[PDB]
Design an enzyme around this catalytic site. Structure first.
Site, PDB file in Angstrom:
ATOM      1  N   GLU B  35       0.829  -1.194   0.000  1.00 33.42           N
ATOM      2  CA  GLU B  35       0.000   0.000   0.000  1.00 33.42           C
ATOM      3  C   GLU B  35       0.868   1.251   0.000  1.00 33.42           C
ATOM      4  O   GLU B  35       1.864   1.337   0.726  1.00 33.42           O
ATOM      5  CB  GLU B  35      -0.936   0.020   1.210  1.00 33.42           C
ATOM      6  CG  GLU B  35      -1.731   1.319   1.352  1.00 33.42           C
ATOM      7  CD  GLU B  35      -2.906   1.192   2.295  1.00 33.42           C
ATOM      8  OE1 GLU B  35      -2.956   0.208   3.061  1.00 33.42           O
ATOM      9  OE2 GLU B  35      -3.782   2.083   2.275  1.00 33.42           O
ATOM     10  N   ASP B 100       9.941   6.122  15.257  1.00 40.35           N
ATOM     11  CA  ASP B 100       9.844   7.557  15.001  1.00 40.35           C
ATOM     12  C   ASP B 100      10.235   8.322  16.259  1.00 40.35           C
ATOM     13  O   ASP B 100       9.660   8.097  17.329  1.00 40.35           O
ATOM     14  CB  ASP B 100       8.418   7.926  14.554  1.00 40.35           C
ATOM     15  CG  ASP B 100       8.240   9.416  14.266  1.00 40.35           C
ATOM     16  OD1 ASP B 100       9.233  10.172  14.230  1.00 40.35           O
ATOM     17  OD2 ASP B 100       7.078   9.833  14.067  1.00 40.35           O
ATOM     18  N   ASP B 102      10.908  12.328  17.727  1.00 42.66           N
ATOM     19  CA  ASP B 102      10.647  13.750  17.523  1.00 42.66           C
ATOM     20  C   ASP B 102      11.410  14.582  18.542  1.00 42.66           C
ATOM     21  O   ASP B 102      11.530  14.204  19.712  1.00 42.66           O
ATOM     22  CB  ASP B 102       9.148  14.073  17.629  1.00 42.66           C
ATOM     23  CG  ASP B 102       8.385  13.775  16.347  1.00 42.66           C
ATOM     24  OD1 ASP B 102       8.927  14.007  15.246  1.00 42.66           O
ATOM     25  OD2 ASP B 102       7.228  13.315  16.445  1.00 42.66           O
TER      26      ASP B 102
END
Lengths: 258, 391
Positions: B35, B100, B102
């Site tokens: 996808e 991830d 940040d």
């Protein structure tokens, strides 16, 4: 120094319950009654319903054991030599396969409840019975040199667990136990629940597991094999449809879970 | 919109990205059933795209011309054929294990910048987080086929592409995430929940972070020079109420002492308070609090939403950040955001040279090409080992 020197069904169930627990591995044979079919299924269903009820009430293993153990002597006996009890246990499990293979939700509920009952009964065993049962299932320990090389990391990993799970508050006692303890090496993906809680030591993609832990592997294998057998049971339900006298009983048994 | 069209037509490395996501020079289900999602300047967002080949991938991204596109899981059937399927019939099989980080998660202790702003002074947080994570991925989990990618403004993404990592279920991903998630509560008004003695992961991470605590936290950032911030973030991590009260009173009488000075005041006041036979135990507890503070301040901080599901979609490498204009390049631990290329600069360089290899983007393409070559070699070796084991 001096020296000297159907029955098959009964022998089968004696063999199957020598370990006191079974993975429910084999096809039953011979006959029982339809009344027995219904009653035995309902008895196991009552125990599993209470297990699921307690788990939905978020009760602990000790509380569930206190609740469920008095029910074995009435509904589904355990740690017993009786052929009738052994056949009752075995057949009731097999009946509820046919009741609960029918859908994914039913399969998940039955696998969860039956695996928790498996855990309960395994806790009731002596360590010798547990060892014999595990060995009978054909279920890699690390070398002493590898244990010595990883001893600092393994001891740092298990020292808290030895204190809290085995009550070894004295560091001297923990050291002696650790000196006597064995460890198992396997891929980390196989014990990921212990990984997420940082209860096992990880090295190069392998998890190092002490021998006093690891029952989750046994119960997970039981759950996985039961799920696969239920999927198989589902695929040959059209053969069950040849005796109409069983379908109302199975519909009644499944209605309490829907 | 025209700059993005030029970027996809002139600069984006479609061949290397195709080789990474397909795990093969020739097409496979790893690309056909993968996808992809596309985000557009109109505000539109389109899921369930998938591509038959590198030519199809490049042509469709060029034709659509999105601001960015995002990478999802490999499925049992092509996502582009979802109109032929019931929603329950399209199912995921694999996705790269992604983490991830940040910069905004370190604003409890960062001072030089706040929010989505960044600089090389504070990126040492991300560099150390990458170092600890890489140590975990290599030493604990045994991974090798992974790469870090700059988010374009404020974070870093690690894409793990090892076959055993790609095959993790959602439950397995959540437990892997829990294994590497140490600071599970971001709030500053408590000491950490970690058990003692440390698990080896925690001990090694602490020993890796200890040499950088003074220089980063106490000197570079210096967040505890503010007395109220120290009382709100540094003191609640300590084990004893009398110590906390003494430090609070002393700093309110002697304000604006730096983080280094306060860090020394903790030891001095504890030594003054805890005399007698219990002094060794109190010193040990104080040391535990300081160790937990090092982990609380410098350990990797992670977005759980990116890792906890296989089907999740994340901004692809070499995308353009819509606000900053930076390229979402691959990176390593020595990176800082000031080193990232920008779309306008790359357009200028291409107008001057008409060759991507002479732009500032080519070192990052070289890193990605080397990573793809290593990944493909390891994939082929794994297939050979599997075939030999089957034989």
């Amino acid at each position: 120094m001096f020296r000297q020197s159907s029955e098959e069904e009964k022998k089968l169930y004696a063999r199957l319950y020598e370990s006191k627990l079974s993975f429910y591995d084999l096809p039953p044979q011979g006959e029982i009654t339809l009344e027995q079919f219904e009653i035995w299924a309902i008895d196991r269903l009552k125990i599993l319903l209470e297990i699921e009820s307690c788990l939905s009430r978020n009760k602990s293993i000790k509380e569930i054991e206190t609740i469920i153990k008095p029910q074995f002597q009435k509904l589904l006996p355990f740690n017993t030599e009786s052929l009738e009890d052994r056949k009752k246990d075995y057949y009731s499990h097999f009946i509820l396969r046919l009741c609960f293979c029918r859908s994914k939700e039913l399969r998940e509920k039955f696998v969860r409840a039956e695996t928790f009952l498996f855990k309960i009964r395994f806790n009731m065993l002596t360590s010798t019975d547990q060892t014999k049962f595990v060995q009978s299932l054909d279920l890699q320990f690390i070398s002493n040199e590898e244990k010595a090389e990883l001893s600092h990391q393994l001891y740092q990993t298990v020292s808290a667990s030895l204190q809290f799970q085995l009550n070894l508050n004295e560091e001297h006692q923990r050291k002696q136990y650790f000196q006597q303890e064995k460890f198992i090496k396997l891929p980390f993906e196989n014990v990921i629940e212990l990984v997420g809680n940082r209860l096992v030591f990880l090295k190069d993609g392998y998890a190092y597991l002490p021998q006093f832990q690891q029952l989750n592997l046994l119960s997970n294998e039981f759950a996985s094999k039961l799920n696969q057998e239920l999927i198989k049971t589902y695929q040959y339900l059209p053969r069950l449809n040849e005796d109409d006298r069983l379908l109302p009983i199975l519909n009644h048994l499944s209605s309490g879970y829907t | 919109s025209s700059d993005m069209e030029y970027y996809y037509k002139s600069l984006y490395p479609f061949k290397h990205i195709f080789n990474w996501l397909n795990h093969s020079p020739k097409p496979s289900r790893d690309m056909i059933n993968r996808e992809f999602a596309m985000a557009f300047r109109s505000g539109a967002y389109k899921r369930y795209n998938s591509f038959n080949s590198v030519q199809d991938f490049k042509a469709q991204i060029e034709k659509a011309n999105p601001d960015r596109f995002e990478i999802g899981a490999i499925y049992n059937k092509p996502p582009r054929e979802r109109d032929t399927l019931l929603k329950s019939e399209l199912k995921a099989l694999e996705k790269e294990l992604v983490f991830d980080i940040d910069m905004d998660d370190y604003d409890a202790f960062r001072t030089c910048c706040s929010g989505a702003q960044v600089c090389s002074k504070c990126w040492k947080f991300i560099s150390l987080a990458m170092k600890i994570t890489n140590t975990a991925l290599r030493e604990d989990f045994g991974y090798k086929d992974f790469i870090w990618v700059f988010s374009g403004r404020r974070g870093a993404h690690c894409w793990v592409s090892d076959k055993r990592a790609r095959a993790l279920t959602d439950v397995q991903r959540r437990n892997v995430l829990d294994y590497v998630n140490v600071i599970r509560d971001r709030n500053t008004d408590k000491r950490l929940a970690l058990k003692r003695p440390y698990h080896p992961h925690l001990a090694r991470s602490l020993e890796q972070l200890k040499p950088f605590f003074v220089s980063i936290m106490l000197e570079e950032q210096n967040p505890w020079e503010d007395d109220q911030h120290a009382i709100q973030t540094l003191l609640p991590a300590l084990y004893d109420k009398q110590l906390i009260d003494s430090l609070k009173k002393y700093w309110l009488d002697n304000p604006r002492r730096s983080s280094k000075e306060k860090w020394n005041d903790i030891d001095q006041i504890a030594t003054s308070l805890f005399k007698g036979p219990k002094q060794d135990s109190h010193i040990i507890k104080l040391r535990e609090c300081k160790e937990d503070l090092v982990l609380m301040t410098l350990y990797p901080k992670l977005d759980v939403e990116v890792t906890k599901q296989t089907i999740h979609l994340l901004k692809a490498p070499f995308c353009i950040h819509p606000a900053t204009g930076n390229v979402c390049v691959p990176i390593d631990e020595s990176f800082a955001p000031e080193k990232a290329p920008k779309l306008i600069d790359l357009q200028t360089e291409m107008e001057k040279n008409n060759d991507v290899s002479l732009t500032a983007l080519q070192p990052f393409i070289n890193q990605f090409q080397a990573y793809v070559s290593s990944l493909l070699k390891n994939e082929l070796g794994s297939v050979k080992r599997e075939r030999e084991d089957d034989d």
